[PDB]
Amino acid sequence: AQCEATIESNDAMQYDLKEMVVDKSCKQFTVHLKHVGKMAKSAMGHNWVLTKEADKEGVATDGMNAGLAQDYVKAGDTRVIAHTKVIGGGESDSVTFDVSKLTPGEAYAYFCSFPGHWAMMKGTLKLSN
């Protein structure tokens, strides 16, 4: 979508994309998260979080402990490349990140850090041309 992509989250605790590709010509990347469900953020809130695949579970665990006001992301967690807000049904959010944060040919994990969702809601992101 240039240097943008749109991802959908629903009431089934799913994302519609399992992988994202960042083009090499991009200096900035933008992700647009949409919550196409009708459930409340307290019940089935979704976010989109970018980490080294390695940091997935540790960031997820710390995020859970941060609470909803922190969007289920430990504040200033340095393992976090980018993340959106936690949204409810009918909402959306966008995050733009600096691509030079990514290392070519390395796979990254994107997941939802709302409590219990990282196990069902995850995908890979990589830089490719």
Residue 20 structure tokens? 């994202």
| Beta strands in 1-129, from DSSP E residues, in sequence order | 4-9, 19-23, 28-35, 49-52, 82-83, 92-98, 108-111, 122-128
Ligand-binding annotation for 46, yes or no, is yes
Q: How far apart are CA 86 and CA 54, in angstroms?
A: 22
For residue 19, CA distances in Å to 5, 31, 114, 125 come to 11, 13, 20, 6
Nearer to Cu ion (CB atom), residue 82 or residue 121? 121
Nearer to Cu ion (CB atom), residue 81 or residue 117? 117
Ligand-binding annotation for 32, yes or no, is no
Least Å distance, CB 60 to Cu ion, is 11
Q: Is 110 helix (H, G, I), strand (E, B) or coil?
A: strand
Residues near Cu ion, by CB under 5 A: 46, 112, 114, 117, 121
Least Å distance, CB 121 to Cu ion, is 5
Residue 62 structure tokens? 């710390």
Nearer to Cu ion (CB atom), residue 8 or residue 53? 8
Least Å distance, CB 115 to Cu ion, is 9
Least Å distance, CB 109 to Cu ion, is 14
DSSP state of 41: H
Ligand-binding annotation for 26, yes or no, is no
Nearer to Cu ion (CB atom), residue 46 or residue 56? 46
Ligand-binding annotation for 35, yes or no, is no
As annotated, the binding site includes 46, 112, 117, 121
